[PDB]
Amino acid sequence: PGPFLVIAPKSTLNNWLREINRWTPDVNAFILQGDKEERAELIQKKLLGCDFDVVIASYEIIIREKSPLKKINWEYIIIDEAHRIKNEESMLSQVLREFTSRNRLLITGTPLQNNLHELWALLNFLLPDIFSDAQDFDDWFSSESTEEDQDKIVKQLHTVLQPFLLRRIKSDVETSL
DNA sequence: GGAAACAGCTATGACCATGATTACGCTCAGGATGTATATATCTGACACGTGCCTGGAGACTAGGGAGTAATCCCCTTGGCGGTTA
Numbered sequence: 001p002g003p004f005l006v007i008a009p010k011s012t013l014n015n016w017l018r019e020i021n022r023w024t025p026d027v028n029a030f031i032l033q034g035d036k037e038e039r040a041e042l043i044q045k046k047l048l049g050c051d052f053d054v055v056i057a058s059y060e061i062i063i064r065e066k067s068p069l070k071k072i073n074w075e076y077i078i079i080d081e082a083h084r085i086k087n088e089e090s091m092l093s094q095v096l097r098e099f100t101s102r103n104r105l106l107i108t109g110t111p112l113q114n115n116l117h118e119l120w121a122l123l124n125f126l127l128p129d130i131f132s133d134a135q136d137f138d139d140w141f142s143s144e145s146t147e148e149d150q151d152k153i154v155k156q157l158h159t160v161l162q163p164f165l166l167r168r169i170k171s172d173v174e175t176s177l
Numbered sequence: 178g179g180a181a182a183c184a185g186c187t188a189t190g191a192c193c194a195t196g197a198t199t200a201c202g203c204t205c206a207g208g209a210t211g212t213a214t215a216t217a218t219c220t221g222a223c224a225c226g227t228g229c230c231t232g233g234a235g236a237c238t239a240g241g242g243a244g245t246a247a248t249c250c251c252c253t254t255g256g257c258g259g260t261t262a
Contacts, residue, residue, distance in 0.1 A: 010259075036261080060259065 001027070004054035005062075005069070005101070006078035013056050016080070020054070029054040032061055043068050059084060059092060066095050074101035082108045085125065086118050088134075097125060111167070116143050 006029075008016050013031045020029055032042055032055055039061070046052055047068065062069060077099060079085070084092045085106075106126060112119045120137045131137060145153050170176070 058259085064260085 001053050002075050003050070003052070003072050004029075004076060004078065005074045005099075006054055006056050006080070007062065008056060008058065008080050010058050012080070013058060017056055027054055028052040029056055032057040032065070039065065047072070054078075063091060063095050066098070070099060074099060076103045076105045077101050079104075079106045080108075082106050082122065083110075083113075086113065086121055088121055088124075093125065097128065116141060 006016060013033065017029055017031050020027055028051065030042060030046065030052060032039065032047075034042070043065070047055070050072075057065065077096060079096075084090050085096070087093065104126060106122060108122075112122065117138060120131065120134075124131050124134070124137075141153065141157055144157075145151060
């Protein structure tokens, strides 16, 4: 049981704290909310005191709290609704390539929205030392064969990501019928 | 019957109210003053003719400024979300 970092949109920080209490009450988590002073007593007392397991913050708070969070090495950076990361220049991306966690569990509700460029934008922060490349990934696959429309080289895209990534749909396993 | 005590009357002073007087201002007076006005007469400067000539106005060629098309890509724009001073 160690240091954990999870991120939720402002509207959703209640739910994750609510569900963690309902299901596994043994984990120390905070909703890191409040004012500049009201975030401080969280910083020095509990966050600096290493008196927690997970920390629930918002999109901007981590940017507001980048410096007091670097000094704590993490286990995962749990990223719900990972849509702000679609842009590499979205400032949240440059604040997350700076933290040092052993694993980096990105989470989403919907997959990539528009482009292959976007796909490895999610993918490049997953295993950065492996790719370390931006346009190399792109012209390697050449955008679903945008010129020849072979639509068979897409199988190579699928074959790497199938044992590297997991999709399930509601229609298959209803759970709601 | 005498003495004290109080009450009412009287007078006088004080204070307020009214009348007059005066002084000052101003607004009429009236004088002083300076300004407009008109006129008749100089006069110098502005306007106009004359002559002349050289810039202005065509007349002509030639070569690149300006003008357009096509292209693109970067940027401004706007609404929001969430903070905070």
